[PDB]
Write a protein that binds this ligand. Structure first.
Ligand code: HEM
Ligand code: HEM
Ligand SMILES: Nc1ccc2ccc(CCNCCCc3cccc(F)c3)cc2n1
Ligand SMILES: Nc1ccc2ccc(CCNCCCc3cccc(F)c3)cc2n1
Ligand SMILES: C[C@H](O)[C@H](O)[C@H]1CNc2nc(N)[nH]c(=O)c2N1
Ligand SMILES: C[C@H](O)[C@H](O)[C@H]1CNc2nc(N)[nH]c(=O)c2N1
Ligand SMILES: [Zn+2]
Lengths: 407, 411
C-alpha cells in the first residue's frame, strides 16, 4: 500500500503514497509486466470534472470553501445542460502544468512549474492555428535562450470537429524513398512527407528540408503552411577536435516541439496542444543520427575516424557514438542554443524525485524512458528504482489523424 | 489470450502464448508497474501440484505425455510425498530442471546457450569439505584453461529449513573489500561486509586491492567453514589497452569465471539453496559496472586524468569517453589471453535470434528489458528496440536472503 523505492548507489529510500491516487490503468497485471511495450458521456464527465476541481482547490488551499463548492455546482450545472464545460484560465494553466508534472516518461520535469501557457481556445481556422504556432515558435526559441511553452487549441466537442496538428513535431526534416531504394533525409517522416506532397507541397528533395505545417481546424480538411525560415533556429554540427566533422553536412533544429499528443484535463480532451522545451543531447546524437532506422550515420563517421570496423569487439560503434554526441553538445553550446547533456539532466531529475517525494508523496517515473540511450549506468537514474503509474491531468497518444479523418 | 511484441527497428511482430503457463506473480498490477524494482518451507499440501506440473512438463518435453512411465512416476512421487513429505528427482529430471531454470531466466541475455549446461549432481554431499571438493571440480571443469564451459553444481535440497546447504559467498570467485579507518575502501566495495564475515571466521586477509576471497561453506544447516580455492585454479587476466601503454600501470586485473553462488533453484516445488552456476562474462559486466560504478572500483576519474580529457564540464562527455576505453581494454585483454568473453553487440544480437526462435518453437520467451539492455550504448544494441514481456515460469532461479541474517549459530 505505501511503497518504497531505493537508490542502489546512495541507499536513499523514498516512500510512495501518491500512487494510491492513481486512476488510469498501466497495461500490467500480477501475471505479466508490460513495462517495455511502447503503447499498452455526461455520466462519465462529472466524476472527472470533480476529481480535477478537488485537486485544484486543494492546491490553492481552498478545499471545502464556498468558492470550491460554488464552482463544483457551476460546472455541474454547465455539464447537465451543455454536455461539456469550459475551464477557467487559472484551471487551464494548472491543468497543463500538471499534465507535464505527471508525464512519467519525461526526465525534464524539474522545470514543470515554469511553463508558459498560450490559450488559443478562441481559434477557429487553420490560418489562425498557423498564427498561434508561429507566435509559439518565436516565443519559445527566444533567439536560442529557450523557454518552455504549450499552446492549447479548442477542446473536442462531438469528435466530428477536432482540432489537430498533423505534424508529429512543429519542426521536423523531410524523408523521401528513392528508386535507388535507400532513403534521403529522415526516414521516420517518409509517410508524412508523402501526405504533404500528396496535399501539394513542393519538396526541395534535400537531406534537411524543414517540413510544412498541416493544420486542421474544426474537423475540416487540413492545410499546408511554411513556417517562416527566420523562425526556425538551426545549428550546424561540428566537432571541437575533428575538422572533417563539419564536412559530413549535418545540422539540427534547436526547438523540440511535440504536436501530436492529446492533453486531458478534468475529462476534457485537447487534441491539439503542441508543447516545446529544449533538447537533451542524446535525443539528436544517439537517436536521430545513430538509430538504424533514422539518419544512421555511425558507419560513415567511424570511417572518418579510421577505427577498426572489422570486429564488433573493438567497440567502434561505441567510440563513434560518443564523438557524435560530444559534437552535438559542442555545436549548440557554441551557437548559444540551450541544450542539456544526459549527465546534467539525469542528476536534475534525481533532485526532482527527491522534491516530489517529500512535497507530494511521490513521482511517477518510467525507467525504460528515463534512463538515457547511452552510458545508462554512469547516470544516477540507472541505479534508482522508480514506480510507474498514471495520474491525471495527462498527455496521451492518439491515432495519427489520416487514419481517422473524413474528407 | 495472444499477446504481440513489436521490434520497432525491424517491424518484426511476435505472438506470445507461453505467458498463459505463468503461475507466479510479477509485483505489478493494473495500477502500478514495478518493472524497475530490483526485488519486488512447504507442506504436502502445496507440494504434489508443484510436482505434477513439473512432471507433466518433463514428460511432454520427452514426447511421453500420458505414457505408462509418466503415470507410474506421478504415482511414485505422490506416495513418496505423503510418506516422506518430500521427494527426490531422477537424474534426468534434475538436468531438465536446471536447464529450464536457465531458459526461464528473464533477466539473462545469454540464454541462447541454455541447453549446453553441464550439470553436476552433488546431492550425495554431506559436509563442507565435500562441498569444497565439489566446487573445486566445478571451477576447473568450467575454466577449462580459458575455453569456458557453462556449468552448475547442485547440493542437497531443503528439508525442514533447518538443515540447509548454502554457499555464503555471492560468487565463487570475487575480490575482498576493506573499509579503512579514513572511510576509503581498499578493493571491491561490494564485498566489504562479506569480507568482514570471513575475517571474523579467521581468514587472514592479505589486504590488497585484488585478494581472491575464501569460500565460506555451510552443509546440512551447520556453521560455515572457511576454505582457500587453490590459486592455480583461479584464472585471472591483467587488464591493458591496445593503444594506451599506461593502462597496464593502473594495476587492474579481473577473474575469468563468473559463477553466481547465492541463488535458489526451484524444480517441481523442491528448493535447492546451494546451486552455484557459471558461464562467461559479457565485457560490460566488468568494464561498465565492476570498474565504473561509483559504488565499485570507480576508476573513471583516474582513467580520464591519464587521457587528459576535459574534466571541468560533464558536457565534454569525459565520463563517456573513459568508459568506452575501459571496455575496449577489458575485451582486448580477455581475447589476447584466449579467455572466453563476449561483447555487448554480439551478445544482444544473439539474444534477439534466441528470442525469435523461442517464440516460434516455445510460443514465448519471458524477458526483462531493464536487465537485458546493456548498461552502455543501449540504443545501438538491437534489444533496446525490442518490446519484451516479462513473466515468471518454473523451474526458476530466485533470490534468497543472505545466510548471515538467518542462520542459527551452533558455536
Ligand atoms: C524543458 C526541457 C525538456 C527536456 C530536456 C525534456 C526531456 C525529455 C526526454 C529526453 C524525453 C524522452 C523523449 C524521447 O526519447 O522520445 C521526454 C519525453 C516526454 N516529455 Fe519532456 N522534456 C522537456 C520538456 C517537456 C515539456 C515542457 C513537456 C510538456 C509540457 C514535456 C512532456 C513529455 C512527454 C509527454 C514525454 C513522453 C511522450 C511519450 O510518451 O512519447 N517535456 N522529455
Ligand atoms: C554463458 C554465458 C552467460 C552470459 C554472457 C550470461 C550473461 C548475463 C548477464 C549480462 C546478466 C545480467 C547480469 C548483471 O548485470 O548483473 C545475466 C543474468 C542472469 N543470468 Fe546469465 N549469462 C550467462 C550464463 C548463465 C548461466 C549458465 C546461468 C544459470 C545456470 C545464468 C542465469 C542468469 C540469472 C539467474 C540471471 C539474473 C540474476 C539476477 O536476477 O540478479 N546465466 N546473465
Ligand atoms: N527535449 C524534449 C522535450 C519535450 C519532449 C516531449 C516529448 C518527446 C517525445 C515525443 N515522442 C513521441 C514518439 C514516440 C513513439 C511512441 C510510440 C511509437 C512510436 F513510433 C514513437 C520528446 C521531448 N524532448
Ligand atoms: N556472465 C554471467 C553469467 C551468468 C550470470 C548469472 C547471474 C548474474 C548476476 C548476479 N547478480 C546477483 C545480485 C544482483 C543484485 C540484486 C539485488 C541487489 C544487488 F546489489 C545485486 C550474472 C551473470 N553473468
Ligand atoms: C521497446 C522499447 O520500449 C523502446 O525501444 C523504447 C525504449 N526506451 C525509450 N526511451 C526513450 N527515452 N525514448 C524511446 O523512444 C524509447 N524507446
Ligand atoms: C533500479 C534498477 O532496476 C537497477 O539499478 C537495475 C537496472 N538494470 C540492471 N541491469 C542489469 N543487467 N544488471 C543490474 O544490476 C541492473 N540494475
Ligand atoms: Zn509492469
Amino acid at each position: 500500500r505505501f511503497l518504497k523505492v531505493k537508490n542502489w548507489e546512495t541507499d536513499v529510500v523514498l516512500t510512495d503514497t501518491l500512487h494510491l491516487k492513481s486512476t488510469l490503468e498501466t497495461g500490467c497485471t500480477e501475471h505479466i509486466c508490460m513495462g517495455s511495450i511502447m503503447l499498452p458521456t455526461k455520466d462519465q464527465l462529472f466524476p472527472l470534472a470533480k476529481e480535477f476541481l478537488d485537486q485544484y482547490y486543494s492546491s490553492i488551499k481552498r478545499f471545502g470553501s464556498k468558492a470550491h463548492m460554488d464552482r463544483l455546482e457551476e460546472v455541474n450545472k454547465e455539464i447537465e445542460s451543455t454536455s461539456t464545460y469550459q475551464l477557467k484560465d487559472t484551471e487551464l494553466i494548472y491543468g497543463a502544468k500538471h499534465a507535464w508534472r505527471n508525464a512519467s516518461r519525461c526526465v525534464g520535469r524539474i522545470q514543470w512549474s515554469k511553463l508558459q501557457v498560450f490559450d488559443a481556445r478562441d481559434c477557429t481556422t487553420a490560418h489562425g492555428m498557423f498564427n498561434y504556432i508561429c507566435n509559439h515558435v518565436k516565443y519559445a526559441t527566444n533567439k536560442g535562450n529557450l523557454r518552455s511553452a504549450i499552446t492549447i487549441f479548442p477542446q473536442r466537442t462531438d469528435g466530428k470537429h477536432d482540432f489537430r496538428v498533423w505534424n508529429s513535431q512543429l519542426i521536423r526534416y523531410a524523408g523521401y524513398k528513392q528508386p535507388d531504394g535507400s532513403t534521403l533525409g529522415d526516414p521516420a517522416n517518409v509517410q508524412f512527407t508523402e501526405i504533404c506532397i500528396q496535399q501539394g507541397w513542393k519538396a526541395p528533395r534535400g537531406r534537411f528540408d524543414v517540413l510544412p505545417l498541416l493544420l486542421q481546424a474544426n474537423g475540416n480538411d487540413p492545410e499546408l503552411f511554411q513556417i517562416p525560415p527566420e523562425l526556425v533556429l538551426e545549428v550546424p554540427i561540428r566537432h571541437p577536435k575533428f575538422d572533417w566533422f563539419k564536412d559530413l553536412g549535418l545540422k539540427w533544429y534547436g526547438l523540440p516541439a511535440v504536436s501530436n499528443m492529446l492533453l486531458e484535463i478534468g475529462g476534457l480532451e485537447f487534441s491539439a496542444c503542441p508543447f516545446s522545451g529544449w533538447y537533451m543531447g542524446t535525443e539528436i546524437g544517439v537517436r536521430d543520427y545513430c538509430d538504424n532506422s533514422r539518419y544512421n550515420i555511425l558507419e560513415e563517421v567511424a570511417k572518418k575516424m579510421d577505427l577498426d570496423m572489422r570486429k564488433t569487439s573493438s567497440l567502434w560503434k561505441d567510440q563513434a557514438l560518443v564523438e557524435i554526441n560530444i559534437a552535438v553538445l559542442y555545436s549548440f553550446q557554441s551557437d548559444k542554443v540551450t541544450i542539456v547533456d544526459h549527465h546534467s539532466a539525469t542528476e536534475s531529475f534525481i533532485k526532482h524525485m527527491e522534491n516530489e517525494y517529500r512535497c507530494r508523496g511521490g513521482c511517477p517515473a518510467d525507467w525504460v524512458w528515463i534512463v538515457p540511450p547511452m552510458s545508462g549506468s554512469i547516470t544516477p537514474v540507472f541505479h534508482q528504482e522508480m514506480l510507474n503509474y498514471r495520474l491525471t491531468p495527462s498527455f496521451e497518444y492518439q491515432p495519427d489523424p489520416w487514419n481517422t479523418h473524413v474528407w
